[model samples]
Structure formats: C-alpha cells, structure tokens
Target chain A: IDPFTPQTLSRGWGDQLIWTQTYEEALYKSKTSNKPLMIIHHLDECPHSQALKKVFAENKEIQKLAEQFVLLNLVYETTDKHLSPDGQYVPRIMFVDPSLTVRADITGRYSNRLYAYEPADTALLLDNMKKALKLLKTEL
Target chain B: IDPFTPQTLSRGWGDQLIWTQTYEEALYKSKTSNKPLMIIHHLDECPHSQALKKVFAENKEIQKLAEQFVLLNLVYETTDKHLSPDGQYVPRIMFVDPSLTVRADITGRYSNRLYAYEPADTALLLDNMKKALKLLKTEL
Candidate 1:
C-alpha cells in the first residue's frame, strides 16, 4: 500500500481499485479525463460501510465495472452539498459525470439512505453502477 | 481484535478463525483437545507470506476446514528444529497431530520450503490440509 494513501481508504475497500487521493483533484480530473467519478463517502468505523465494502470488494463484476470509473472513497465528507444530495451520512455512494454533475437520481435501497448500499444491496449497487456507466454515455 | 494477539497474527489472515495466540499454548491445546495443530510460520514483511495469507484468508473452503485444527500463525520461528522440517523460511506451514507428532509428510509446493504455500498453491494447501485431517482419523 502507498504510505501516502489514507490507511482507512483501502482498509475495508480492496487494493484492486485505483482510488484517487482527493475529492478536489478527482472532481477536476473527472471532467478533464472524461470519466465518471464514483465517490464513496464512508466512515471506516461504520459497520454498514464495512459490510458494503466487503461485498463491493469481493464481487468480480463490481471490480470490473469499477475500472471504468475514477474511484474515490472518503472517510471525511466533502463540504459540497451536491455531493450529499440526500444528506451527509456514512456509507453514502455518489456518482459524478465527466460533465462534473453529481447524479442524485442514482440511489440505493433506503429512502433515508438514498445513496447507501449494504451487503444485502449488492445487486442494487451493481445496477446503479451499471446505470452510472450507461448514463455517462447518455450524457454525451 | 484480542488485545493479547500479536499484531501481525491476524493482520493478513481474517479475524473469523479461532487462532491460538502462541506456539506453546497452541501445542498444549492441540494435545489435550485432541485436535491437529495447524501452525503457520510467516513474517508480515515477506511477499510470499502475503501471497499465502491472501489465499488462506479469502477461500471459503479453507476457512471452513481451518476450524477443525488448533491454529497458530507465527511471525517468529519456534526454536524447535522439528517445526522447520525443511528450512526456516517465511510462509512455512506445519501440522502437528494430537499425538504431539509433527506431520512432516504433509507438505506444500517448494522442494526447499516444503511447508511453504504460495498464491498459486491454494489447491495444494487445501489438499495437504485435507490430508492432515485424513491422517488424524487414521492416527486415531
């Protein structure tokens, strides 16, 4: 593991994903690089984050789809309100297009946890991830 | 995490296993409890140890079979020469029967590191682990 990368960034999340170090640089690169930004808001201490991470990291399809997006998982919340369209909470999953717009429409199982995905919500996360890619094409 | 467990013991290996904290204690329990002692010789720094640990921690079947044995994964070598039947190297794996005999016959991939298991050697490890269990029944 790179010593500079936040320890908790890949603690629950696997080393397989190329995680961007900062939300600011990732946001800028998202537009410049022409790729969707998959910013995962997670507290390493949260059990929900751990469960979702376990499923996300282990699934082969999720790993493959992950390669398409610019990945960033944060222990700290971004001050940007658009990033947390629902509310600021741990284990929130959000997608930002190459156009640099947060995809608030993409969501998880819970109405309260609109952007949260649990272990049970793996398929739903996969679908939303796929939709993130599909919408990226549609945005163009 | 058990405050008593050595930091490196379960760092790579999953926390799910009932891992014995020390060689002497594990050896004693292996005899009185009549369960085979699956003691792993490894250093946290060795890449081979990392590879072997990755495979050991991930496999569902390996985890299931691991429960049958009194487990110990050590960073430091036990001075007992019989433990290192082949050579003192990172990622060595030895099995001690309930009768308190080291099963040198049960081994892994390397000609030199007989007790060694690698990322590619998971099936071989599984086979040897099964052999250990089979021999235990035969020993009785």
Candidate 2:
C-alpha cells in the first residue's frame, strides 16, 4: 500500500530540493535568494495528481533544475486570484520569478490545462523550467 | 498647433518619461533596464481615450510615479493575448515587471474594462500605480 500515491503529499515531489511549506515563506526566500519560485498545486484522491507526482519526483533533470528555485508544493489553495487564471485544477504548475510576478506567459499546450504537465509530459515541464531560468537570467 | 491630441501620439502621456515606440522595444528595455513597464492602450478618436489622456498627461503625481516605469502608450494592438485578458477596449492600462510577466493581479474597479481609467478615475490609476510600485519594491 503506497500511502503517498492514493493520498497526495505536498511533498509529492519528495525532499530532493528544499521545499517551503508556506507560500509566504517561499515568496520571502525567492526575494532574498534572488531565485525564481515554482509552485505546484495538487490534491489527494486525485488520480491525475497521483500519476503526475510519480514522473515529477523521478525526473533527474527536473530535480536538478528545481535546486535553482524556491519551491513550494501545496495540496491547498491560496487567496491569490492570479494563480487560477483559467480555473483551479489538480496538479497545476505555476512559476514566479524573484521579482514576485507570476509568470503567466509560460504555459502548457492544453487550453484547459494552461499550467499543467501530466505523468508522461515531464519533458514539457522541463522545457518550461529551462525557459524560466532563461527569463530569470535575462530579465532579473 | 496643439497637434498631439486630435491624432493619437504615442507620446499621449507627453514627454514626462521617454516612451517606447513598439512593444518589442518596450519589452526589451524593461528586461535590460530592470524596471517595470506600463502599456497604455488607447485611440485618439475615442472620447473616453481623449478624456483619460488629458488626466494621464497632466497628473503630477502620475508623472512622478511614471518616472519609475518604462512607458509605452500605443494606438495599435499587438499580437499578445495577455493584454486583452478581458475584452479589448480603449483606454486600457497594463503593467509588466522586469521578470517579463504581466501583472494581471492588478486591475481597475470595472469588470468590463479591467484595465481602464476614465478622466475622473485617475485616482484609481494612481492607486494602481502605487500598488505596482509596492509590488516592484517587495518582489524585485
């Protein structure tokens, strides 16, 4: 019985990179560290979240890139309306550079899932991560 | 000849701050200069635009704050989808930070004109500008 799978963990990506438990703390660190932030919004009892977490945690390249970010993975929602531009869904991935601006420009291919990557689409996630780094370097 | 008004000048806000002629140049400068960018979308023929531009150009407080931003007032539309998050309308004002992200979180009081400020509502615009500056300071 995989307790992690059937139930979503905010630590779904595992403890490979330092993860902030709270959005406020993550935002604080992003500013102080002058690093970009990656926020993962997920849920328990969600098959999609369960499946995506597997690929998200196991990816070596993503884990490596995650080190550059002030990362926060959450099973709950925040008061910020910017996070839910289209609509809130499970396993949504969003980026915010140290400038404290949500990177709404970088999006997934799906119209419905604007900021999502599925179990097999870790490549797209990696691409966005690289793009985020590129933006951080060039803009910040 | 008070030639600036009847025909839309990209310098609609006057020479308070140097205005970028194109979206490409504005985006580029915003990244390079590490400053927030403001895009004022308006048309000269519009009564609302005509009314708003007068307040926008003359407001001393706005002029003072406008100095902190990379300004671009456009009479034409660009291909960017984010700028028209609501419906496209005259006298729309949008903000982008150095991180190359649109600050969709900041908006006007109106639902229809999400980024609009009429002549009388320069106060709202001023308040929004202050909010942008606050975000820039804390986030950047």
Candidate 3:
C-alpha cells in the first residue's frame, strides 16, 4: 500500500518532494545553506498543483537543480502581500535570494494571474535557475 | 532567446506536447482508431497544468504510453457531472475505453479531493495505464 496517495494531502505532498510548508523554515534554511528560496504557492485541490508536483517528481534534472535552493511549498492563501505579490492563485512559482530579496528579474515569469495556471518548462526553469544563481553570486 | 519563458504562455503550451483541446475531438479519434481516450482536465494558467505538460513532453516512456490512446486536453471546466464526477478540478486524468466507458475501477487512484494536489508517479501512472488496458480488454 502506497502511503503517498491522494488521500493524505500534507503527507502526500511531502512524499513527492523535499518541501517545507512554513515560510520561516524556508527562510532559515536559505540563510543556513546560503541558498536561494524557491517558494511555490499552490492549492491542494488545484490541478495545476498536481501537474507541477508530478513534473517535479519525475524529472531528475529539475530535482538536481532544486537542490541548490531552499524549497518551500505554500499550499494555502496568505495575508502577506510580499509572498502573494500576484493576485491569489494556486501554483505560483517564485524565488527569493538569501538576502530575502525577491528576484525582480524573474518578474515577468510570475507577476500576475495570467500565469497562475502555467508551469515552466525544464529549459526555461533551468535558465531562470542559472540566472538566480548568478544573482546570488553577484550579491554575495 | 529562450522561447519558453512565462512571458510566452500560448506558445509555451504548444511547444510542450501535441494536445487536443476538446472532448469531442478525442472521442472521435478514439472511436476511429479503436483506442482508449486519455482525457486530461486542466486550466490554461494553472501551474500544475504547466508541470504536467512539461513532464509529458520530456518523458519517452510516458509519451509511448500516450500513443496508445486518443489524447484529449480539456482546459475548460465541464458541466457534465459524469465527466467531473469527482469534482470540478483541473489537471485530472481519466481514461475512457473504446466503448466510451470510464474505467470505474481506477477511481480509487484519483477520486475526490485526494489527488487534487497530487500528480501521479510515472510508475504509478504506468501501472494504472496497464490496468486500464486490461479493463479495456475484459470489457471488449
């Protein structure tokens, strides 16, 4: 019996990826590891969330790239406008460098509700990952 | 320039996979070819939809399995309770046999809100596909 079935939401999510549900935990991890924070805001019941989870689970390269960051999975709505910069929507993927500065260059990637349903391709995501790394390096 | 950045939503989805946007078209193709219907319900701006698209585009084995079916990508919500039997959620994957019968046995895999936020694993998805094929055979 697979414990990571859809029946268990939080546990199921954890089983799929190395994810932290708390924003503070991600922040602390980022500070500790000297890594950027990759925050994903999504709903458990949203299809977009499901789709992203599968892709993150299956792709080795994406998983490898993810290692360079402090990954956070925010599954609910938040009062913090800083986190929910865009209108409230599920599966919003974004990044914050160790300095706690959001990657403004990646703005066009997830700035509004238009892209709430969209997922990034491996190449596109990788390119952005490289850019984020560069930004982190320059800042440090 | 990278073609798949979030600035390019319409183009990004197309570049990922060959997907049909309507149920009618998929049904027609499935009936004509005597194949199963692989229906994927998703939202255009949803992140999960984007993730699923990327995974489907990148994996050879999954693509090979997809070839066995008449694939349909339903991006809009449907009123028909029969189709959205579980709930109105995007990124839901279901299989309809050549006879147009939904594989009820597979409901355990993604019924209700359990899998709304979860994407199926490749091994798990493949196992379900095999089970669906078996069901198709027994029904015939």
Candidate 4:
C-alpha cells in the first residue's frame, strides 16, 4: 500500500486541504493571499477531530470549499493558541478571515453539545466555511 | 458542552459498535446467540479507525447489519490477536463465525492497497458483511 500517495493518504485525513507546516506560515498566507484561515485544532488521540478529518476528506464539496482557505492543522501544537469563543478545546475548528480575527459568527452543533463536530455535523462545518468565505469577500 | 455524554465520549472509538469487552465473551455470545463475530481491530490513535467508527455509527443500514453479529472492538490489544489473511494491521475488520474461526473469505479494497480501512471503504465492509452472512446461512 502506497501510504504516501494523496489518494491513499487522503483517505485518513483530507490531503487536499494542503496543511501548512507552521501556524505563522498559514497566518501569513491567509493575510497576504486574501483568503480565510481554516485552523483545525486537533490531537492525534481525539475522536471528534478524527471524525471531522474523515468527513472533510470524504466530501468533495467540503474539499472544494477548503481550497479557498489557508488550511492549518495544528495537531498538539501549543505554540499558537486560538481558543473558540466558547472555550479552549482540541477538535475545535476556527475560521479566521484575512483580517486575522476569528469569525464570531461561525458556530457548530457541537459548539454547544460537547465541543465536538461529528460526521452528522458536516453541514455546520460547511456552513461555517461559506460564512468565513463571505466574511473574506467583504474584505475584497 | 457536555463531554461526558455517549454522543461525545463515543466519538473517540468504537462507542458506536456496542462492543463486547472480551474475546472469550464475544466468542461465547456468537455461539449462544447464533451470530457471527464482527471483530474490528483498531487503535484509538489511528485516524482510519476513527473514520470507520464514525461511518459505522452514522450509517443505519450498516448498523442494522452489525446488530446480527457479536461485535467486538479490539483496541490496541495484542494479547488476543486476530490477523487478517493479509497479516496484522490496524483498522481491519474480520468476521468470526459461531464455530469461533475467522472467516478468511472477507475482503476490502484497501485490504492491501493502503494496509488500512477508511470511511470511504464502508461499501467494501458492508459487502463483506453480507458475504459473511451468506456464509453463515449455509451453516444453518
């Protein structure tokens, strides 16, 4: 099995999202490129984050929507902290526009349920993507 | 967010499968209940396993099919190893008939392609389940 190939590797996580190595690089790209930032705060051990990862990878629409952002998958990185409006938690997704500010309008079911995002919660994630993009469009 | 609930906590692993805790228990149940043993060899740390967990949880059809089996989610346990025909691997699913023997007839796309199973591989999983059920029928 060629685990390195995108088709194979992507099945585990959304390889199309093109993860940025460092938070600073993603932040800079989001600002300079006029794209929003889709920062996924996750842990290798967190199931909620893993579910989001699978959903993101499997959905063509979400993959397309994700291309519009500077994707940053910060796995267990404590250097740059971006807490949700609700609280600090792993498996949390934050959308930051070109202005380098977390969009307060974005919300998920798990936003209040358990600080989680499930496969059933894909719509909320997609909706937040559109909202983040719209917020970025206002900047341009 | 209520992190303690089944909806949240179950997302971590095989919370969806209603797994039997021990291999011996599952074997006994499979024999007594006249059901096959659906053994899911997984790891909490494996994204592929997490994806499978979510997919299995979300799909009603698969869940219904799963109900016919003595489901066991063996997470990172080396003591009772059940190797696939291809060899040992995580995120692997195997079927054990009431006779307590692994059904070597089962197969999946990534069975050798990536040495792992993803949510995208659910169709293959379901297909194998049906095949195992057919095999079980012949014994009856």
Best by lDDT: 2
Q: For model 3, what is the alpha-carbon lDDT of residue A115? A: 48
| Residue range A99-132, candidate 2, lDDT tens digits | 8777756664454443445567777777777666
What is the iRMS for every candidate structure?
Answer: 17.3, 20.1, 16.3, 17.3
For candidate 4, give the docking quality class from DockQ: incorrect
lDDT, candidate 4, A1-140, per-residue tens: 54554563214322233334456666664655456677655566766566667767778767676664555555554644344444356655667767777664576444564334667666767766665566424357
**Poorly placed runs, candidate 1 (over 4 Å):** A1-140, B1-17, B108-116, B136-140
lDDT-based ranking, best first?
A: 2, 1, 4, 3
- Model 1, residue A25: what's the lDDT? 53
TM-scores, one per candidate: 0.39, 0.39, 0.37, 0.37
Candidate 2 residues lying further than 4 Å off, grouped into runs, are A1-16, A108-116, A136-140, B1-140
RMSD of candidate 4 to the truth, in angstroms, is 18.0
Clashing pairs in 4: none
Model 4, stretches more than 4 Å misplaced? Answer: A1-17, A77-87, A108-116, A136-140, B1-140
Backbone clash pairs in model 4 (N, Cα, C under 3 Å; residues 3+ apart or in different chains), count: 0
Tens-place lDDT digits, model 2, residues B1-140 = 54545664333322333434566655764655466676655567667777866876778887676665655656656746765556366655667776877775666455444344556777788777676655535657
Superposed by TM-score, candidate 4 places the C-alpha of residue B138 at a distance from the truth, in angstroms, of: 77
Q: Residue B105 of model 3: what lDDT?
A: 45
What is each model's TM-score for chain A?
0.67, 0.68, 0.63, 0.65
Off by over 4 Å in 3: A1-140, B1-19, B104-120, B136-140
